[PDB]
Structures are given as structure tokens and as C-alpha cells.
Design an enzyme around this catalytic site. Sequence first.
Site, short mmCIF file in Angstrom:
data_model
loop_
_atom_site.label_atom_id
_atom_site.label_comp_id
_atom_site.label_asym_id
_atom_site.label_seq_id
_atom_site.Cartn_x
_atom_site.Cartn_y
_atom_site.Cartn_z
N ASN A 186 0.83 -1.23 0.00
CA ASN A 186 0.00 0.00 0.00
C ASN A 186 0.85 1.27 0.00
O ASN A 186 1.88 1.28 0.67
CB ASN A 186 -0.86 -0.01 1.27
CG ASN A 186 -1.94 1.09 1.28
OD1 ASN A 186 -2.55 1.38 0.26
ND2 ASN A 186 -2.18 1.68 2.45
N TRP B 259 2.46 -4.76 2.42
CA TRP B 259 1.40 -5.74 2.36
C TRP B 259 1.72 -6.85 1.35
O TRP B 259 1.16 -7.95 1.42
CB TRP B 259 0.05 -5.07 2.02
CG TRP B 259 -0.49 -4.49 3.23
CD1 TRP B 259 -0.59 -3.17 3.56
CD2 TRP B 259 -0.91 -5.23 4.38
NE1 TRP B 259 -1.05 -3.05 4.86
CE2 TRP B 259 -1.26 -4.30 5.38
CE3 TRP B 259 -1.03 -6.61 4.66
CZ2 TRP B 259 -1.72 -4.68 6.64
CZ3 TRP B 259 -1.49 -6.99 5.92
CH2 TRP B 259 -1.83 -6.04 6.89
N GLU C 96 11.32 -4.05 4.15
CA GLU C 96 10.25 -3.23 4.73
C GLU C 96 8.93 -3.98 4.72
O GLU C 96 7.87 -3.54 4.20
CB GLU C 96 10.19 -1.91 3.98
CG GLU C 96 11.27 -0.95 4.51
CD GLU C 96 10.99 -0.54 5.96
OE1 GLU C 96 9.84 -0.07 6.22
OE2 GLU C 96 11.88 -0.70 6.82
N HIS D 237 10.66 3.83 3.99
CA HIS D 237 9.76 2.69 3.74
C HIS D 237 9.73 2.24 2.28
O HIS D 237 9.91 1.06 1.97
CB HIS D 237 8.33 2.98 4.20
CG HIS D 237 7.42 1.78 4.07
ND1 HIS D 237 7.66 0.60 4.75
CD2 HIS D 237 6.33 1.55 3.30
CE1 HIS D 237 6.76 -0.30 4.41
NE2 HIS D 237 5.94 0.25 3.52
BR LIG Z 1 -0.81 0.27 5.27
#
Ligand SMILES: [Br-]
Length: 295
Positions: free
Chosen positions: A37, A108, A131, A271
Site C-alpha cells: 500500500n 502488504w 520493509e 519505507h
Molecule cells: Br498500510
Amino acid sequence: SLGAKPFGEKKFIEIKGRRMAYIDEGTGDPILFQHGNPTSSYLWRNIMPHCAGLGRLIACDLIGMGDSDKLDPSGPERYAYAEHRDYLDALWEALDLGDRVVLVVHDWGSALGFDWARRHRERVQGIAYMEAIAMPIEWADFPEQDRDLFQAFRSQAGEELVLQDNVFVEQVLPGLILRPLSEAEMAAYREPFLAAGEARRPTLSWPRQIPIAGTPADVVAIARDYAGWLSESPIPKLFINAEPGALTTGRMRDFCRTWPNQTEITVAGAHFIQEDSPDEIGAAIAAFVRRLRPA
Ligand SMILES: [Br-]
Ligand SMILES: [Br-]
Ligand SMILES: [Mg+2]
Ligand SMILES: [Mg+2]
Ligand SMILES: [Mg+2]
């Protein structure tokens, strides 16, 4: 190198009534790259070239993201982890991957990838991760700088912040990449979420799924399962560590460093590290795959 051009054009497969998009280039055993995401296959565009000639390079867009179709009806109950897994499992089966898959995962995409590997262990030749959501965590383990905002996404404020203001795409994404993005790169990430409302639901449902402080209990159970398994698995792993990093730091990073049969490299990034150190990341994945597939 860096660059704004996508790695290839999107191919489409029908999954459960919806069309799902993915990049598929080259031939050979698969090297499957999975975004999280609020990204899409575009995240891997400068990393995949490093694996040219090493296998079939594939990067799928999750349902409701990238160029994959939106679900309708959509609302607070849509795009939860289980629904994403249902669509992705079907797409990965549809792709005829065989049994020597090298997974390359992030965010994710790592939760989905780790979960699928636990369930299809004999088909996984190696796992490269970075990450990642490697285990359930506590708020104390979450990056300090975004703790309040993620608690807000998880509260009823989430609908205004994301569905109306598009904050995950406009603020969290750029905020977790060290270098400034060009308009073309930012446009590529904004594209699937240009429309106010339910079109943005995936970027709001995702933070509501992070296994934190035991909630939501269903995803916590799933992550507990794959964490326990990875920590004991002899499958070759490549841990692409980041500095300063964001999610895979502190306790989670110490846990990952205990995983067996693992090679590690550290690259600069927060990230979304693929946007800061793509060549170093790609070169290490290529070296890893060459060891796994001695030519
Ligand atoms: Br998220
Ligand atoms: Br819950
Ligand atoms: Mg259709
Ligand atoms: Mg679209
Ligand atoms: Mg920390």
C-alpha cells in the site's frame, strides 16, 4: 538506474469477474515482485531490469489498485486482507508459476507473499524481502513519526483523511521516500486513486488491517502463523535491510535477523526504499537468483 518509465505494459487476466493487471516479461522460472500500500507494480520498475535473463519477471497489481479493477459495492467492509488474498491466490494460480518461484516482496505484498509461501512451501525457491510486515507488532514498534496518523486512519477519521483528502497517496508515500519524486512518478502512484470516494478505499482498508496491539485479530493470527514458519524455514532468504528504514527496524529487524539461510544487505531508504536505492536492491536480488539458479 532511476527513471520514471514503467518496466513493461500491463497484461490482464479475469479473476472472479474482475480484470487484474500485471507485468510479465521474459522466460524461465518466475521471479515474482509484489507491491503493497498505496503502490502498484510500478514500484519495481527499476529493480526488475537487474534480473533480465534470469527468469520470467512478473509484478501483479492487487485488486482495486494499479490497473486492476475496483470492487463495487465498496465500503468499510471491502478490501480487507482476506479479500485481497482471495483475488491474489487466484491470479497466482492463473499465471502457471510452477514450483521454483522466487518471491520479492514489500509491505502488504510481504504479508500476502509470506502467507502464500507458508501455504505453498515446496514451490518457493527463495524469498527476497524488505520493509515487510514480518510479525504482529505493538504501537511501540511502529515508526514514531507516523503513529498518530496511522491511529487516525484506523479511527472513523479515516474516511475523510483518505476517501476525501487522499492522504496515504499524497502524504505518507512521498513522506517515506528520501528523494523528491518527479511529477511522472507521482502521477503513476496517484493514477488509480485520482477519484474521490470509494476508488481510494484500498488505501484506507490497508492500514486498518496492520496487525497492531492484537487488532484486527484475524490478520494478527495470519501474521503469527507465517512469522513462526519463516523463522524455522530452510528456504534461502535475502533480507534487504534499510537505513533508516521504517517498519523493519527495532524488534522486527532483530526477529528477521534470526531467520535461517539468509543473506543480508543494507540500502539507504525509509519505507518505499525501491525509490531510493533501486540499483543496489536489484543487484543483490540478481546475485541471489544467480546462486539459486547456477548457470
Ligand atoms: Br498500510
Ligand atoms: Br478485532
Ligand atoms: Mg470486466
Ligand atoms: Mg484504472
Ligand atoms: Mg522503532
